[PDB]
Amino acid sequence: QQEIKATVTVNTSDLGNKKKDDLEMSAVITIMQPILRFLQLLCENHNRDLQNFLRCQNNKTNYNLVCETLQFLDCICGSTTGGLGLLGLYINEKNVALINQTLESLTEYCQGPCHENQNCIATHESNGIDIITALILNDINPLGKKRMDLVLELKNNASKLLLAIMESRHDSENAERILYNMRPKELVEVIKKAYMQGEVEFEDGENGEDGAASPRNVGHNIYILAHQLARHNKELQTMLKPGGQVDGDEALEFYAKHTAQIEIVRLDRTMEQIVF
């Protein structure tokens, strides 16, 4: 983190007068990717003991690796200024893999109803969650003109992480923060916008049989997240209702007719509500 903060070079000389290979990843930075991969693999298959052992070791001093990973993501993606639509000039082709690995590791920290990890990530002192919401909402430039697949992977992983944050919990302790960061509108226009891109790419054909990173799937994940968030936002509930006089709702009816809610009971005799 210290190396990234000191050696980050964002040219702000291209930033004050106009619209009226360099510094390869260091060894101390390149070694994060294997570290994150190992710490991810320690928690696969929803290993509860190792999931909650990475946050409180019950030793003389406890080191929280989840918070540290969140801070690493926050610093690499552009800190608090990155989440204001400035992610484009903080994310390059070099660090896409590292950000993807951080997102996957965070997701597997949160997969399964590990309530403590989700509370820790959502209510952290730093501002990583704002970075994630900015990844979902704001576009990336100039990555959005050359490498579409990388941006799609980033958006997909951010969507998966936010679903894991709101996984199998209807408490209003974590949804109010996510609603505070992004208003219901931008949710609705992002959902709508994904639909046109998906239909355009599907009309071309040529082996488009349910791609993992398709914009349609990303929009579907965003719709699932909005459906889960709407239980604490009546305005979002009203906007999610289809059949409105405003055009462009066809995405809303498409996503509403492909989304299902069920209700299971966990082994400890507790009920969870699943949207898929």
Partner: peptide, 26 residues
């Protein structure tokens, strides 16, 4: 950090037409 980014190259050093939006943003 953000103040450092704003100050360190608020001086005139280039002439294009692609920056005012992030002037306002940052």
């Amino acid at each position: 950090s953000a103040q450092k980014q704003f100050w360190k190259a608020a001086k005139p050093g280039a002439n294009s037409t692609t920056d005012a939006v992030l002037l306002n943003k940052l």
